[model samples]
Target: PITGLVYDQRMMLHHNMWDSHHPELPQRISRIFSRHEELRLLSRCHRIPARLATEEELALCHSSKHISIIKSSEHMKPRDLNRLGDEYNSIFISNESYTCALLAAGSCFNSAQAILTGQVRNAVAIVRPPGHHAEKDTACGFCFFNTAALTARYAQSITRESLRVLIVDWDVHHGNGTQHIFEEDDSVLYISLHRYEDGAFFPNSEDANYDKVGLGKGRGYNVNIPWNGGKMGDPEYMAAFHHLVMPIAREFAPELVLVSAGFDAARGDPLGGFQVTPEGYAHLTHQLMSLAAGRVLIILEGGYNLTSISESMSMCTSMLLGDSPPSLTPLKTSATVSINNVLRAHAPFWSSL
Candidate 1:
C-alpha cells in the first residue's frame, strides 16, 4: 500500500509576514518536508498535487461572511491586519495568511480524496496556519481555517452516505473548535487527547472535559482524553492508545481516519510540557493504520518546537510508509490515573470501555 504526502509552498507563505516571536511559524511545513527528504521518506510516497479549497468547500464548515472577512484581510494594511487579528484570540493575520490557510484546508482535503480514490493507503498532509482551534464562524488560536474539520466535512459530502469518519487529535491543546463543529454530528467522530490542567490550558474551557462527550444524536461520538498537569511521555500515550483509543475506535468502525498530528506533546516543545517521543507518535500512527481498512490521513496541527515537530512528523510519516515503530524505553503496563477518570466518565457511552 502506498502512502500519500501533501505539501504546497503557498502554505509556507502564510507566515506572520509580521512576527519572529510567534510559535505558529511558516517554517514548520518545510522543516518536516526537509526531514522527510533527509530520511528518504518522500521518495516512496505519493506526492499529491495541492490546491485551494473553494468557497463551497469552506462553507461546509464556515460562513461565507467569515470567509469574506478573512479574504478581505489579504488587502488590509499591516496596522489594520494587526487590528483585525486582535479581534480573535491568539491570531496574527497577513495577506499571505488568507492564501496559506486555504491551501492548508485544500491540501488536507486533497490528501483525503487521494486516499478514498485508492491512490494511497494513507497520507500525511503538511499544511500551515494549523486548524482544529478555528471555529465554524471565527478563527482562534492561530487558526484561520479549521483544516481537519473542513477535511472531515469534505469527505462526508463527497462520499455521500455511509462514510463514517474518525478524527484523532493528539495535539497538546484540546481542539475546542473541532469538538464544537462535530459535537452534534454523529457521522464524524472526534477524539482529542490534550492537557486540560483543570481548564488551565490555553483555549481553556470545561468542554475539554471527559464528561462533555457529544450532544443529542452525536452522543458518545466525541472523546476527550484530558491529561492532568505534569509530563506524560511515551508510556502514558502508548497506554492511552492501547486502553482507550484503540478499543473505542475499533468499535466505531469508521470508514476513514484523520489524525490531527500535532507535535506539541513531543519532547522539547517549550509551549507543551508533555514528553511524548517521536517514536511514540510512530507507534500510535501504526496502531491507527489497522483501522478503516488501513485508510488514514495525518493532518498537521499545532507544534511549536521546530526540531520536535520535524522529527515527530517524519517519524509518523515513516510509520505511514509501513515501517514498524521502535519501542519505547519504559514499559506501558496500564493507562494513567487520568485515563481511569475518563474511563469512568465514558463507560456509560461506549461499551468498549
Candidate 2:
C-alpha cells in the first residue's frame, strides 16, 4: 500500500519553473523526479495515480477570497502581482499553473482519502507551488495553497471528529504562513527549523527561538529551531529531531504526520548554504517514518540542486522501503560542532523532551 502510492498525479512534472527562468522551483523539482526515474525508484516503486482536490475540498481549509486571488492572478502585471507578496519573483503563470496547483491540492486530498479508505499505508505527494508558504487568506512563498494544512483539515473532517496532526517542516526557510494559519488551534502541532541570514528571506520567520511557541492551548505546541550560519547541517537537523520534535511528538502521539518536504537544504543547493547531504535526508525520512508507524505523508516544498535532490530523495525512498542506497558524501565534523553548539543553546527548551 505505502509502496504503491509514491507516484501520485499531484506529483506530475510540469515544466513550470522552466517556463519562468528560475532554477529553484520547477527545474529542481523536475530533476529530483527525473532522477527518481533514473534510479528506478519511480519505475520500480508500487506507486499509484494521485487524487485531485475539489473546489469544495480546497474551500474547506482556505477562505473563498484567498482562493479567488490565486485563480484570478494568472494574468496580473508586475504591480498587481506584487500585491500578493514579495515571494513570487516571477509572474510566468500560464493556464497550466492554476490547473497544476489544483492538481497538487487535489493529490493531497487524494492521499488523505487513501489513508482514510485504507488504500495505502502512506502517501508522499511531490507537487509544486509548494504549499507551506500559503496562508489562510493570502498566497506566499511560491505556494498558492496550503496542501499539507488543507490535507490535515480534510482528513480531520473525513476521519475522526477530533484529530491530532503533527507537522515537521525541515525546509531551509521557516513556514511562517502555516504557523499563522493554525496559530490558535491546538489540534495541529507545527514544528519548524530554518536558516536565518541577510534578513531578506520573505514572510520573516528568521528566529526559531523557543519563545515563539503557539498561543492558548497551543502553548508549547508550535516549536521553532532557528540556526545561524556555519552551525547547521546533517547532524544538527537530526539532533533537532532527536532532542526536540520526536520526544514531544511521541508524547503527543499524533494520528498522522504531514512532512513539508523541501530539498532546498540539499548540500549543493544554490538557494541554501547548508551542508545536509543526500544521506542526511535519508536518515531524517527513516526516523520520521519509523516514529509515525509509516503513517507519514510527504509533500514537495523547496529544493534547487538537481544532482543531489533526486539522489537524496532516493536515499529516503530506499530507507522507507527497507533498501540501502549507494554511498554519499559524509557529514563534516565542523558542521557537527556548529550544530551541537546550536543544540546546546536550545537545550533548555527541549530538556523535558
Candidate 3:
C-alpha cells in the first residue's frame, strides 16, 4: 500500500489572491481529499502529516534572494501582492502563502521519507499551490517552490550521496523550472511529457522542444516528449511511455522515482485539452511503480478541473493500494511517428533505443 501526506488543515488559511474563482484555489486540494474519502481510498493507505520546510531546505532548490522575497511577503497588502504576482509570472500571495508553500514542499519531503524508511512501497503528496513551474529565482504558473525538485534533493541528502533520482513530469505543460534546475546535473534524469505546439503553450519556451535533451554531463538525461498538439489520449501517452520513457528510465536505473503528478492532462481540463483519463493515470502510476525497486513519490502539480483532479487522484491512490485499474479500451496510435523521431534524437545517447 501507499502513504498519503497532506497539510494539517492550517494551510487553508492562504486564501485567494486575485479572486475566489482562481484556478489554483484552495478548493482544488480540498476536492481531491474529499474524493479520497468519497472513493473510500483513504482507508487503504497510511496518512502522514505535513511539516514545515525550513529556510535552508528551500535553499536546496531556490536562491536566497527568492527565498527572502517570498518570506517577506507574509503580510503584504492586495496592491503589493498583485504587483508581486505580476512580477513573478502571475503568482499571487496572501499572508499565509509563505506557510502554505512551505507545508506543500514539506509534504513532499514527508512522502519521500516514508518511502525511504520502508513504511510504504509508494507515496503521494496531494499538495496545493503547485510547484513544478517555480524556478530557483522565479515563481510562475501559480507555483511558489518546486516541491518535486526539493524532494529529489532532500531524498538524496538523507539517503546515500550517490543516490540516483528520476523525475517524470506528465503535467500537460512542461515543468520548465524542474527541467532547468537539474538540466546540468548527471545524478537526476528529468523526463517531461507536455504540450509544446511550437513553443506557443503556457510558459512558452523553445527549450521544451523535443531536441533540448540536456547539457554537459547531463546530456541525454533530460528527455522531452512534446505533444505537438492537444486532444491526445491514452494510446499516445502509453505509446510514449513504452517506447521512450520506459526504455530510457530502465537504463538510468534510479534509486528514487518522483512523478510530477498533474491531472491537467486528464480529460475536461480547462487549460489542457488532452484526453487522458483517470484510468490512464492509474496505468501510468503502475508503470512507474515498476522502477526504483518500487520506490515512487508523486507530488501534485497542475490540475484545474475539480472533477478531473478528484477522479484522477482517486485512481492513482487506488493503484498505489494495489487495486486493479479499469480496463482500457482499444488502443489508438497517434504518437508512434513522434516517438520514432524522439528515438532518433536520443539514439546517440541511448543506443539501445
Candidate 4:
C-alpha cells in the first residue's frame, strides 16, 4: 500500500503564484485538490503531511554559491540577474518564490525520509519548483534545486553508505541537472524520456539527445530517449518503456526507484501536445513501481493544465495504491511511427540492454 505526502501550503509564485499569468496557480492547485476530494472518498487512499528539509539536504545537490545567489535574489531584482545564472530566467524575484521553493524542497526531503525509515514502502512528494532542470551551479528552467536528486543524495549519505539509485524522469523537458550530478558516477543510473522539441525550446535541449552518453567511467550509464514531435502518444511511450526501461531496470537492478513524474505529458495539458492519457501514466507508474524491489518514490515535476493534471495525478495515485486505472482502449499505433526510426533512435539502448 502507498500513501502520498502533500505540501499543499507550498504555493507562492516566482512571477505571481496567485496571479492569472498564464494558467493561474491558485486555479491549478485548486483543481488538483478539488479532484482529490473525490479521490479521498476512494478506498485505500491516504494523505500524510510533510515537513521542510534542512540546509544540509539542500547542500546535497546544490552548490553553496548558487544557493547564496538564490537567497540574495529574494530581495534584489537586478536587470542582469536573469542572465547572471543558469537558474535565473527572469529579472524579477518575488518573496513568494523564496517561500515556495523552500516549501517544495522541504516536502521532498520529508517524503524521502518516510521511504528510508520503513514507515512506508512508497510515497509521492507533491511539491513545486520541479527540480529536474536545476543544475549544480545553475537554475535555467523554473527549477531552483534538484529535489529528487537531493533526496537520493541525502538517503545514500545518511541512511546507507552504499546505495544504487535509479531516477526515471518523464518530464516534457530534459532533466539536465540530474544528469550532470550523477553523470560520472556508476552508483546512480539516470534514465530520461522527454520532449526534445529540437533546439528551439526552453532551456534548449540541444545537447541532450538519445546518444549523449556519459563520460569515462559513466559511459552508457546516462540513458536519454528524447522523443520528437508526433511520436509521443501512448503506444510510442509504452513501446519506449518496454524496449528501453524494463530491460535496463532488470539489468541495473537498482536499490531504490526515484521518479521525476510530470503530468505535463498528458493529453490535455496546454503546453503538452503529446497524447499520453491518464491511463497511460497509470501503467507507466505501475511499471516503474515494479523496480527497486517494489519500493518507489515519486516527486511531482510539471503539469500545468488543470484537467490533465488532476486526472493524471489520480491515475498514478490509483496505480500506487494497487487500484486498477480506468481503461481507455490503448492508442492505435501512430502512422508516423516505424521500426527503422525507432531502431535508429534506440540502437545504442538496445545494444546496452
Candidate 5:
C-alpha cells in the first residue's frame, strides 16, 4: 500500500516572468507538499526523485519541431519569450520553464516504472506546468508536455502484461491533449469530467463534448463528462462516478489507472467555480483505487485556489494511503443533469452505461 511520491523543488523554477498573477503558480505544488508535510503524509510514502525526460520520452507524444521550440526557449530573451508565449494559448516561457517541464514529464514517467515494478503500489506525481492541455505540436493552457499522456506511453512498455490503462481526469477542464494522443488506440481508455458550457471554457472546443468519443479502432475509448453549469458539487460528481465513471471503468478492467488530479473543481476555486469538497475528492479517489489492482497514479493537473488544491489533494492522498475518508457532503443534494447525456452518448460503447 505504499504510495510513491514524485516531486522536485526545482519545478518551482518555472514562472510567468511578466504576469505575476497567473493562476499556474510555482506555489501550487509547493503548497500541496507543505500540506502533505503538515499531515505527515510525506513521511508515509516512498519518494521517487525527479529527473529530466529524455528526448525519446518527449518524442513519445511531442513533435520534433515542437520539442525544438520548447528547447530554444531556454536562452531566449525575456521580450522574445513573451512574444513566443503569444504564439500559444496562455503559455509563458521563462529561462527554466523548459527544464522544469522536462522534470514534470520525466518524474511522472519514472513513477510509472515504479508502480509496474512494485517499487510502490501507487503514486502521486505533484510535478506541473499542468500537461493535460498540451498538444502534440502545441503548448496550451500553461502546459508544455502532457504528463499523463507521457506516463501512459511509458507504462505501456514497462511489462509484458496487457497494461491496458484507464485515465480518469477530474480536472474541471477537458484533457484534450490526452484524448488526442490515445483517441486512435484501444489500449488506453480516457475518461474526463470537465466544464464545457458548450465550448465557452478555456481552451474551448467542441472536442470537450461527450459525443467526441474516439475514432476508428479507438471508437468509444474516449468518454467526456461535460458539464455546463457551475457550482456542481459533491452530489453531481458522485453521481458521475457511481453512474458513469465506475461502471465503464469496471467494464474496461484496466490494469493501470491514471488520474489527471486537478482540484480546480473544489469549492472556492476562482477559475473553477465548482463546489466539490475535499471529502468528495477522497471518495472519488477511493473509487478509482478499486480498479487497476490499486495501481492508481495521481498526476497533478490544474487547480488555482491554493487552499482548495492543497486540501483536496491531501484528502485524495489520504485515501491513497488507505485512510477512511471523512464523511462526505450529502450525495443526493444535487444530481448531475450532464450524466444522462454522457450516458446516452457512451452507452453504445459500454454496456454498463
Candidate 6:
C-alpha cells in the first residue's frame, strides 16, 4: 500500500502563544514530523508536498464573510489581535495565519486527491492550526478553518461518481464545527467520539452530547459517542469502534473515509488525560483501513503531549505501511451502554447498526 503523507513545513509559521506551555503549540507538528523521521516511517510512504488552497476551494465550506475575516488577519495589529481572538475563544491570528491555515486545509485536500486518484491506498495530512474546532463563521480552539469538512466537499467536487464521505473524529474535544457544517447534509456522515462530561471540556457545548443526532434529513447522519469522564482508554474506544462506528460505516459504505485523527485521546496527553497507547491508535487505523476499499484519509486534528503524539503517529504510519500492529494488551471492552445508546438513536436510519 502506498500510504500518502501530506504536510507543509511552513505550518510552523502560524504561532500564537500566551505562554510556552500552551497546548496548541507549533512544536506539536514539529515533534510529530521529527518522530516520523526517527522511526523511519517516511520511507514507507510517498511524501506528497502540500499546496495552498484556492479562494474558490475555501468557499466550498466557508462563507465569503468568514473567509474575509481570516484573510484580514495578515495585516491586523497586535492590539486588534486580542479582539479577534476574544470574539472566538482560544483562537489567535498572526501575519501568516491566513496563509498557514490555507495550507492546512489544502494539505487535507491534497491527501484526499491522492486517495481518489489511486495514488495512495490511504493518506494522512500532518497539518497545524488544527481544523475540527473551526465553524462556518467563527474560529475557536486554535482552529481557523475546518480542514476535514473542506476536504470532504473538495473530494466530492473531483469525483466522477457520486461520493458519500464518512468523517470519523476521535478528537478529545467534540468536533462541534464539523458537526455544525454538515448538520443538515445527508451525504457526509460526521461521527465524533469525544470527552463530553456534560460539556465541561474545551469548546464545550451540549450539542456535542449524544442526544443531538442531527437536523432534518441529516438527523441520523451525525453520531456523537461522548465519553462522560476521563480515563477512557483502548477498551472504551475499541468497543465503540467495533460495536458502533464500524458497523454503521460498513452499512453506509462510503466512497471515501476521512478520519479526523487526533492523538490527544492517547495516554499521557496533559490536555486529554485519557489512556490510549500508540498501539491502540494503530489498531483503530487498521480497522478503518478495511473500509472504502482501503481508501482512507487521516487528517491531523489535536494531540498535545509530544511523546504520546509521536508514538501514536508512528504506530499509525506503521499500520499504513501494511505492518502488523504491535500486540496490544488483552482487550477488555467498556462503553457498551454508551454504544447501545448510539445504536438506538441511529437505528431509524442505519438498519445494520
Query: Candidate 1 on 249-301: residue-level lDDT in tens?
Result: 99999999999988999888987898898888989999999999999999989
TM-score of 4: 0.87
lDDT of 3: 0.86
- Whole-model alpha-carbon lDDT for candidate 4: 0.71
Per-model C-alpha lDDT, please? 0.88, 0.68, 0.86, 0.71, 0.90, 0.86
Q: What residue pairs clash in candidate 6, if any at all?
A: 267-276
* Highest lDDT model number: 5
Error of 5 at 330 (Å): 8.6
CA lDDT, candidate 6, residue 110: 85
Q: Which ten residues in a row have the lowest lDDT in candidate 1?
A: 328-337
lDDT, residue 234, candidate 3:
90
Q: Candidate 2's residue-wise lDDT over 1-353, tens digit each?
A: 35433343334343343335566355555666677787777755556566557778788768998787677766666555455445453333443455667778777777767756777766666677677887787666667788888888888888875788888888887777778777777888898777754345445544444456777767666877666545367767877777677777787778888888887887887677777888888888777776556777777787777777777766766665666543432435543443455455445544554
Better of 2 and 3 by TM-score: 3
Give lDDT for model 6: 0.86
Which regions of candidate 5 deviate over 4 angstroms?
160-162, 329-335
Candidate 5 TM-score to native: 0.97
257, model 3: CA deviation in Å?
0.9
List TM-scores for all candidates, in order.
0.97, 0.84, 0.96, 0.87, 0.97, 0.96
Write down the RMSD of candidate 1 (Cα, Å).
Answer: 1.7
Sorting all predicted structures by lDDT, with the top scorer first, yields 5, 1, 6, 3, 4, 2
> What lDDT does candidate 1 reach at residue 220?
88
After TM-score superposition, what is the CA distance of residue 179 in candidate 5 from its true location, in Å? 0.9
**Candidate 6 Cα outliers beyond 4 Å, as residue runs:** 329-334
